[PDB]
Design a protein around this ligand. Structure first.
Ligand code: NAI
Ligand code: NAI
Lengths: 291, 293
């Protein structure tokens, strides 16, 4: 097997930046790739701010060390706008770009030609068949899914998705990498939603339908699941937290893929909110109003 | 508005005993009912041990204070083998007996004749229609669902279920009663599973199906839902904790009422474990094996 040490993270967004941060914090050499220097500048600025917010609490008694820890970590992250020039000798590519299949395949189709031989390709996609991306390359045995959770530097869970073509050597290498990141890896096949979303999303939809049906108020439903099932957030609070458009996107995906299943049936309420651009906390309004 | 002060709890099992315990601990006069004096003696004993357990943890700094507390609560809990003998002067009847429609209807049909005019009737049932049970009486305006969660003394939620016939006054009085118990009441129509089970159970079934399908292990699924969704228990640990039989029962009912619905298709693994009489922590084994206490 291979020991991941040099990591190429493509996409410096919410997830990408988090992945690059944890990898660098855990002693991996990292190259963050995005489209423009400005995007990268902002992504790396965000990483630094996050690292400092932590350090100020952990190195309160010794601020010098705190600053070093931060510097050392940032210096271990490099940036580039050209993935091709970076993967020649990288051990792992973790892609977290726009959730679009075409764009993704083109990206990997191209990288497969420049990446080293031992290089492993992994996607952090939520609503896309890992296999539907692996096939865009001739490296399916070194291709898998590595699904993280927001906020990456906080959430310890990582889903290691193995396709029917993924090597066992590749799998274990990702399992070892996950642990080196200080994460707790779980295994799942390349099935829609993998584990978490597959069981969480349809339940969130069910909560909306119960409400749309007029069986109870959103407030009581949230209170019920928090006090009755011990959940951290009620379904509607959580829905606004993960983004209503983000959810709709995943459900429609499963609806088209299987318009017969009652769990993926569209929701008038959900659609309306998204329509009128009310996506949740990231807009100040979803099922509830914030800020 | 008549404020519930005297409560008759019918059924001294897991749920009724807890309801009785909480009502008694919050200043309500209580009468616990069950088939025999032994069952009752044992139920009340389980309530004492539960009280003494919390006492030795709340009154560590003064064991005597704890003793007084426990004794006071325990004393406000009378016991009777026939509820008909005390409902003529009770404000609320909370039933928590075997989950069987006919047995429940028979019970309430008879009590309807002894209960004071103002007395409210409430069932803690998880799978039966409150309306079905209410129509066993001629007191539907004073009939409703009052659904608790195990362990009752700990779970703060209570679902107040209103049938199309339940009166606003009956509803409000149960809402006030819930708060008086120190619980947080939520409202729901008389629909299958009300709020919690309707959203929880189908999810547990999906968990089993994902596993049976072989997409992931039970262990990984539990880890994933705990770390990924922040749940206190993975679905399989929760299934064993609430009872596999208890779960299968609720689902067969929904499947029965709508056999074409995919959400209620039975689970081979679930039926098998239940068939092997492996009901979870109850029997020392469910999806996981537990250390026989
Ligand atoms: N939003 C979430 O909480 C989670 C999302 N995901 C998945 O992670 C991926 C990342 O989504 P987010 O970080 O939230 O989105 P984001 O939009 O915040 O970040 C994506 C980044 O990708 C860049 N990008 C787009 N196309 C590119 C290309 N061809 N080459 C290089 N960079 C490109 C964008 O400039 C942007 O900075 C998606 O595949 C999504 O399904 C996975 C788990 C959780
Ligand atoms: N077990 C659970 O977690 C939950 C159960 N429930 C519901 O609450 C009810 C209570 O169930 P559990 O406490 O679990 O069962 P249980 O079997 O532990 O207790 C039921 C008690 O009812 C008594 N009983 C049966 N027929 C009777 C009659 N005619 N008169 C008086 N007592 C009679 C039994 O002797 C027994 O002590 C059921 O309807 C159930 O669906 C509701 C919420 C949660």
């Amino acid at each position: 097997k291979i020991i991941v040490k040099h990591v190429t993270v493509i996409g410096g967004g919410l997830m990408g930046a988090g992945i690059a941060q944890v990898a660098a914090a855990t002693g991996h050499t990292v190259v963050l790739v995005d489209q423009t220097e400005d995007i990268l500048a902002k992504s790396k600025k965000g990483i630094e701010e996050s690292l400092r917010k932590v350090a100020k609490k952990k190195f309160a008694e010794n601020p010098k060390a705190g600053d070093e820890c931060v510097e050392k970590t940032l210096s271990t992250i490099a940036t580039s706008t050209d993935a091709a020039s970076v993967v020649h000798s990288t051990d792992l590519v973790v892609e977290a770009i726009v959730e679009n299949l075409k764009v993704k395949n083109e990206l990997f189709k191209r990288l497969d030609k420049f990446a080293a031989e031992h290089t492993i390709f992994a996607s952090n996609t939520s609503s896309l068949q890992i296999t539907s991306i692996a096939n865009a390359t001739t490296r399916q045995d070194r291709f898998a899914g590595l699904h993280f959770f927001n906020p990456v530097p906080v959430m310890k869970l990582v889903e290691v998705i193995k396709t029917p073509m993924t090597s066992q050597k590749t799998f274990e290498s990702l399992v070892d990498f996950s642990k080196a990141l200080g994460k707790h890896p779980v295994s799942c096949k390349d099935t829609p939603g993998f584990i978490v979303n597959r069981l969480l999303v349809p339940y969130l939809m069910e909560a909306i339908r119960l409400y749309e049906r007029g069986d109870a108020s959103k407030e009581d439903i949230d209170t019920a699941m928090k006090l009755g099932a011990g959940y951290p957030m009620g379904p509607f609070e959580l829905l606004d937290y993960v983004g209503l458009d983000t959810t709709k996107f995943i459900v429609d995906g499963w609806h088209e893929m299987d318009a017969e299943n009652p769990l993926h049936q569209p929701s008038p309420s959900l659609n309306k909110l998204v329509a009128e651009n009310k996506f949740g906390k990231k807009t100040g309004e979803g099922f509830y109003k914030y800020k």
